[PDB]
Amino acid sequence: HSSGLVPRGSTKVKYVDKIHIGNYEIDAWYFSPFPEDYGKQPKLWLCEYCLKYMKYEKSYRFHLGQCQWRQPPGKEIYRKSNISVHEVDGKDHKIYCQNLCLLAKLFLDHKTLYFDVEPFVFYILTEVDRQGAHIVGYFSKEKESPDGNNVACILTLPPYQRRGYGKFLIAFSYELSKLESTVGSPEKPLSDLGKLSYRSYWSWVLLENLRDFRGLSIKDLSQMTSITQNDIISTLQSLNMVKYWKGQHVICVTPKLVEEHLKSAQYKPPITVDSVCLKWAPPK
Numbered sequence: 001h002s003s004g005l006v007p008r009g010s011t012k013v014k015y016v017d018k019i020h021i022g023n024y025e026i027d028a029w030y031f032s033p034f035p036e037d038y039g040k041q042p043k044l045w046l047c048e049y050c051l052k053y054m055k056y057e058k059s060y061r062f063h064l065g066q067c068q069w070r071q072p073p074g075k076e077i078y079r080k081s082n083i084s085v086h087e088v089d090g091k092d093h094k095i096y097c098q099n100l101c102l103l104a105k106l107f108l109d110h111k112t113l114y115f116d117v118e119p120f121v122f123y124i125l126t127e128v129d130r131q132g133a134h135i136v137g138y139f140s141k142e143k144e145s146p147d148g149n150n151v152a153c154i155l156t157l158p159p160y161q162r163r164g165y166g167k168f169l170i171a172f173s174y175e176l177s178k179l180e181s182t183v184g185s186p187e188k189p190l191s192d193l194g195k196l197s198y199r200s201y202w203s204w205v206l207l208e209n210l211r212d213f214r215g216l217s218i219k220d221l222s223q224m225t226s227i228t229q230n231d232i233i234s235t236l237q238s239l240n241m242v243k244y245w246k247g248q249h250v251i252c253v254t255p256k257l258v259e260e261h262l263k264s265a266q267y268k269p270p271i272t273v274d275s276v277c278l279k280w281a282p283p284k
């Protein structure tokens, strides 16, 4: 894709820059390869339930009155109060997942090809009211990850950002890893916002464990949390809670120092994953 001013005499081919979804309008952050004909109109209109993308307010309004979807496809594997997660296999809901990937790419620097959804499972987060289940965000996961990634992409839609939904999704990804009896880590590279979110999540989990146990190796923490030993080490380093002794990382902290960290404004997830509300078994 091109940016900047086009040369003298040329026509700028417009990309999608604004979407209307439910009762939100959202500006694009990046180019997404919707077909060129969809980019030329002032807005792209998305059905908030089936994610079909449309070119006109009038086709949108017709769709709104006809489409019977009021939630994501697939299985509702998590429900606590009005928060739900649906598991959507890319092989079985190809069109929905393609629509989701084109949406997501508007807010991601890079992504795998939007049509290549079969290798992935998608976990869709919704807030539920009387009208339906309204998409907040999602993460995707490779069914088989050569690199041991437990998340491929993660997104909270911009109007829902900074409310804890991203850390909910991160927590959720590690609950899956724990049930699979494996460690995992997000696919690299992480965006700057990605880095802040993961570091916040990892810090909170590790601090919480170091005070609930009170004191427990890095291996122990990894097995308990499914966080990789490398991500534990980088997080403990940022907490000033690790020493290096003859080439080996050694946790070094007291209960008092853990509490100082937990009592500070820098480290309290507004919504957490309740295992009792999760219904999921590993495939595998």
Ligand SMILES: CCC(=O)SCCNC(=O)CCNC(=O)[C@H](O)C(C)(C)COP(=O)(O)OP(=O)(O)OC[C@H]1O[C@@H](n2cnc3c(N)ncnc32)[C@H](O)[C@@H]1OP(=O)(O)O
Residues within 6 Å of the ligand: 107, 108, 151, 152, 153, 154, 155, 156, 157, 160, 161, 162, 163, 164, 165, 166, 167, 168, 186, 187, 188, 189, 190, 191, 192, 193, 194, 196, 197, 200, 201, 266, 267
């Ligand atoms: C796995 C590979 C990838 O997917 S890399 C790409 C990751 N995704 C993206 O960059 C897409 C666009 N961004 C997003 O969707 C969101 O920013 C993500 C990364 C999902 C975070 O979601 P969100 O629901 O806002 O997270 P959260 O409320 O749970 O807060 C997480 C911590 O991050 C911080 N944070 C967040 N946004 C900002 C910001 N604008 N400026 C400064 N800090 C920010 C929050 O304060 C929070 O940290 P803390 O717990 O308050 O210390």
Ligand SMILES: [Cl-]
Residues within 6 Å of the ligand: 025, 026, 027, 158
């Ligand atoms: Cl916006």
Ligand SMILES: [Zn+2]
Residues within 6 Å of the ligand: 047, 048, 049, 050, 051, 052, 063, 067, 068, 069
């Ligand atoms: Zn629809």
